[PDB]
Amino acid sequence: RRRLHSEIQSGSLANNIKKSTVIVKDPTHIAICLYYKLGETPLPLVIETGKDAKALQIIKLAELYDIPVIEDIPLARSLYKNIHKGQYITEDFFEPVAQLIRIAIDLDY
């Protein structure tokens, strides 16, 4: 039998958070989920975003799945405005996102 629309939506959101590399948040309720996989993605990409209730939801799922969350107001707002879901970060973001990822994760290289 088919699952409820709400279950497909919640399940879909959960899976995208679970596979996120790092989430960048603003306390006014923006959350940006970055995805990077060495050899697959040439650059980090924005996999999910949210504002207000959706931001709160993303942040709570992040806590559930132990995904690193960094507060960075200017970077959250700028990514929100500029890098839409499915898009790679652009050059102005390379250094700030690199630094973000190094806060969140121990590479390696």
To one decimal place, what's the resolution in Å? 1.6
Counting every residue written for the chain, the total comes to 109
Distance CA 82, CA 93 (A): 10
Distance of CA 78 to the CA centre of its chain: 13
What Cα–Cα distance (Å) separates residue 81 from each residue in 10, 46, 49, 76, 108? 24, 12, 11, 9, 31
Q: What are phi and psi of 86, to 5 degrees?
A: 90, -10
Residue ranges per domain, the chain?
A: 1-109
Q: Among residues 8, 30, 13, 21, which one has the least CA distance to residue 98?
A: 21
Q: Which CATH superfamily is domain 1-109 in?
A: secretion proteins EscU (3.40.1690.10)
The per-residue DSSP string of the chain comes to -PPPHHHHHHHHHHHHHHT-SEEEEETTTEEEEEE--TTT-SS-EEEEEEETHHHHHHHHHHHHHT--EEE-HHHHHHHHHH--TTPBPPHHHHHHHHHHHHHH-----
Query: Which experimental method was this entry solved with?
Result: X-ray
User: Are residues 32 and 72 in contact, defined by beta-carbon separation less than 8 angstroms?
Assistant: no
User: Are residues 75 and 24 in contact, defined by beta-carbon separation less than 8 angstroms?
Assistant: yes
Q: Among residues 88, 68, 64, 69, which one has the least CA distance to residue 30?
A: 69
